[PDB]
Design a protein around this motif. Structure first.
Motif, short mmCIF file in Angstrom:
data_model
loop_
_atom_site.label_atom_id
_atom_site.label_comp_id
_atom_site.label_asym_id
_atom_site.label_seq_id
_atom_site.Cartn_x
_atom_site.Cartn_y
_atom_site.Cartn_z
N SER A 363 0.82 -1.20 0.00
CA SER A 363 0.00 0.00 0.00
C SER A 363 0.86 1.26 0.00
N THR A 364 2.06 1.20 0.58
CA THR A 364 2.88 2.41 0.55
C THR A 364 3.32 2.76 -0.87
N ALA A 365 3.37 1.78 -1.77
CA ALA A 365 3.80 2.04 -3.13
C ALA A 365 2.66 1.87 -4.12
N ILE A 366 1.57 2.60 -3.90
CA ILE A 366 0.40 2.55 -4.78
C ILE A 366 -0.18 3.96 -4.86
N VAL A 367 0.47 4.90 -4.17
CA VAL A 367 -0.06 6.25 -4.01
C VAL A 367 1.12 7.22 -4.00
N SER A 368 0.88 8.42 -4.53
CA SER A 368 1.91 9.44 -4.55
C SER A 368 2.33 9.81 -3.12
N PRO A 369 3.61 10.11 -2.90
CA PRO A 369 4.05 10.53 -1.55
C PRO A 369 3.40 11.80 -1.04
N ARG A 370 2.73 12.58 -1.90
CA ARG A 370 1.95 13.72 -1.42
C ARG A 370 0.85 13.28 -0.47
N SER A 371 0.44 12.01 -0.53
CA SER A 371 -0.69 11.53 0.25
C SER A 371 -0.48 10.18 0.92
N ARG A 372 0.58 9.43 0.58
CA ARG A 372 0.77 8.08 1.11
C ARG A 372 0.71 8.03 2.63
N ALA A 373 1.17 9.09 3.30
CA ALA A 373 1.06 9.17 4.76
C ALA A 373 -0.40 9.08 5.21
N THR A 374 -1.30 9.75 4.49
CA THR A 374 -2.72 9.71 4.85
C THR A 374 -3.39 8.41 4.42
N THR A 375 -2.80 7.68 3.47
CA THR A 375 -3.38 6.42 3.03
C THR A 375 -3.07 5.29 4.01
N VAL A 376 -1.81 5.18 4.43
CA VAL A 376 -1.46 4.13 5.38
C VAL A 376 -2.23 4.30 6.69
N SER A 377 -2.57 5.54 7.05
CA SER A 377 -3.30 5.79 8.29
C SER A 377 -4.71 5.22 8.24
N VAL A 378 -5.45 5.50 7.17
CA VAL A 378 -6.80 4.95 7.07
C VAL A 378 -6.76 3.45 6.84
N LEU A 379 -5.69 2.94 6.22
CA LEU A 379 -5.46 1.50 6.19
C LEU A 379 -5.45 0.93 7.60
N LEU A 380 -4.61 1.52 8.46
CA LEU A 380 -4.52 1.06 9.84
C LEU A 380 -5.84 1.25 10.59
N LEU A 381 -6.62 2.27 10.25
CA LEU A 381 -7.89 2.48 10.93
C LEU A 381 -8.90 1.40 10.56
N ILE A 382 -9.00 1.06 9.27
CA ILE A 382 -9.85 -0.05 8.85
C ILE A 382 -9.40 -1.34 9.52
N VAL A 383 -8.09 -1.59 9.53
CA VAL A 383 -7.56 -2.78 10.19
C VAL A 383 -7.97 -2.80 11.65
N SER A 384 -7.73 -1.70 12.37
CA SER A 384 -8.09 -1.62 13.78
C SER A 384 -9.56 -1.93 13.99
N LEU A 385 -10.45 -1.13 13.39
CA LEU A 385 -11.88 -1.37 13.54
C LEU A 385 -12.24 -2.82 13.25
N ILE A 386 -12.17 -3.24 11.99
CA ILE A 386 -12.62 -4.59 11.64
C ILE A 386 -11.91 -5.63 12.50
N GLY A 387 -10.59 -5.77 12.33
CA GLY A 387 -9.86 -6.80 13.04
C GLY A 387 -10.01 -6.76 14.54
N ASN A 388 -9.59 -5.67 15.18
CA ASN A 388 -9.61 -5.62 16.64
C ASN A 388 -11.02 -5.79 17.18
N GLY A 389 -12.00 -5.06 16.62
CA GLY A 389 -13.33 -5.10 17.19
C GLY A 389 -14.10 -6.37 16.91
N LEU A 390 -13.73 -7.14 15.88
CA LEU A 390 -14.51 -8.31 15.51
C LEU A 390 -13.79 -9.64 15.70
N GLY A 391 -12.47 -9.64 15.83
CA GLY A 391 -11.71 -10.86 15.99
C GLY A 391 -11.93 -11.53 17.33
N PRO A 392 -11.64 -10.81 18.41
CA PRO A 392 -12.00 -11.33 19.74
C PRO A 392 -13.47 -11.69 19.88
#
Length: 479
Positions: A363-392
């Protein structure tokens, strides 16, 4: 800032972060004790360990992001450390399971306000020649605190309340030796309170010894970007790309399995193999945490070091390393040999977290560096929500439901009506005619649950394969 003082501020903030993850993940090692005293179902445990961090970043995390971008940072970190340390201490002294849930939600409320302000501080203290290594050694906070939680909690668990009462009465704090009977307080209470109590004074000394830097200590000649880096419209760069959502869903299911397993791996280890809380957290917890962190960094590397050459890297075209991690997990759970299970587990953990690290850097190499910082963040947010909240939740409800299946097929509901999980550590006669059968069900439900959740790695692999297909189109190149 300076240089030695700046490095001191760095060490302080990184210890705040390690302490953050210690407090956050320590709850999993005291799973069976907490459910034993409160007579919790595995379902209730998954409820406690997952969705209480939907309040992690959905609330706070986005509000206090603005609050920290616009305010005094060091004060915010000191305050928030006050907050979650106090809330963990309250977890130590919770009367009902609901009070524990509320204190845990407060811990999430507090922990949301750690990384945004510290990130701003570190970027404004350090010059761009050294910002990368600073954020890197700060990012080591999750790794350190992860293995440190297992170590410290395993040590503090299995500590008689009488010992802590005596030590409090011996250093001149006899203002609790008359309050409560220490023979009746459990070890996990001590775990929570002793882990939380350093944070109040640590945040105090942070407030005293770290001066807030002037906001803006970066590069001189600056273009007027007109769109200030990227905010809402920077979302529309990756938001159009379907490989982003395939990657995010695959990583979210990888983390779903991970969070579901870590929520019940100590209960599994002590229900099946009978290891103590301490030995489960120490001889197995910290090594597996280090192995998972090594696998994650290894996946990130192995990707980065051959991701420019060709896309979502793997053998042939499907991401079947996850499909290889599946049989290793199932073998680790179905084995009667504990050392065999441990080594199969470290194998599966490397192979399982490698793809998390992979998808991260793919995912870090699919987006321009002007925004890649903001893309990895929402990646981690989706991961957190779905995974953390639904796995346990999935793992715990599956443990409860598989147990109930054994209950019905063996028709001992009359016995389960008076079943407490606590007195099966010994005292197994003291349930009735059907004690050991009931607790064989208690262990086997969790075993079947672990296997069931592991099966979700096929969904994760499907999403990764989808991303591999759409990546060629979604790739971003300077030409």
């Amino acid at each position: 800032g300076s240089k030695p003082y700046r490095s001191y501020v760095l060490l302080a903030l990184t210890l705040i972060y390690t302490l953050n993850f210690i407090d956050r993940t320590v709850i999993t090692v005291v799973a069976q004790p907490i459910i034993n005293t409160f007579s919790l179902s595995d379902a209730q445990w998954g409820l406690l360990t997952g969705p209480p961090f939907a309040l992690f970043y959905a609330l706070m995390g986005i509000p206090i992001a603005m609050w920290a971008d616009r305010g005094n940072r060091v004060f915010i970190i000191s305050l928030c450390v006050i907050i979650w340390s106090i809330m963990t201490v309250f977890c130590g002294l919770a009367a009902s399971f609901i009070w524990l849930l509320l204190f845990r939600v407060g811990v999430a409320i507090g922990e949301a306000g750690c990384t945004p302000p510290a990130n701003s501080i570190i970027t404004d203290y350090y010059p761009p020649k050294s910002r990368a290594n600073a954020i890197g050694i700060y990012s080591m906070g999750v790794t350190v605190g992860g293995v440190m939680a297992q170590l410290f909690g395993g040590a503090l668990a299995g500590l008689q309340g009488a010992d802590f009462g005596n030590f409090l009465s011996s250093i001149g704090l006899g203002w609790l030796f008359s309050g409560i009977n220490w023979e009746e307080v459990e070890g996990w209470r001590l775990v929570f309170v002793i882990v939380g109590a350093p944070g109040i004074l640590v945040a105090l000394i942070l407030w005293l010894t770290t001066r807030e830097p002037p906001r803006g200590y970066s590069d001189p000649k600056g273009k007027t970007p007109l769109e200030k880096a990227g905010f809402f419209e920077a979302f529309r760069e990756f938001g159009a790309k379907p490989t982003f959502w395939s990657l995010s869903l695959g990583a979210a299911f990888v983390a779903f399995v991970g969070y579901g397993l870590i929520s019940f791996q100590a209960p599994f280890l002590m229900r099946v193999h009978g290891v103590s809380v301490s030995e489960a957290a120490i001889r197995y917890g910290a090594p597996l945490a280090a192995v998972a962190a090594f696998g994650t960094f290894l996946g990130g590397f192995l990707s980065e070091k051959f991701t420019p050459r060709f896309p979502a890297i793997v053998a042939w075209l499907p991401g079947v390393g996850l499909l290889i991690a599946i049989p290793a997990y199932i073998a680790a759970f179905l084995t009667p040999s504990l050392t065999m299970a441990f080594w199969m587990w470290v194998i599966a953990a490397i192979a399982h977290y490698a793809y998390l690290g992979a998808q991260y850097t793919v995912s870090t190499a699919i987006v321009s560096p002007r925004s890649r910082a903001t893309t990895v963040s929402v990646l981690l947010l989706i991961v957190s929500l779905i995974g953390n909240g639904l796995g346990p939740m999935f793992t715990g409800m599956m443990s409860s439901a598989f147990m109930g299946g054994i209950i019905r097929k063996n028709g001992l509901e009359e016995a389960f009506a008076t079943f407490n999980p606590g007195l099966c550590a010994g005292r197994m006669a003291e349930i009735g005619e059907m004690g050991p059968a009931l607790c064989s069900a208690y262990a086997e439900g969790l075993r079947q649950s672990m296997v069931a959740t592991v099966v979700f790695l096929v969904i994760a692999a499907a999403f990764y394969f989808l991303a591999s297909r759409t990546f060629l189109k979604d790739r971003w190149s300077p030409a």
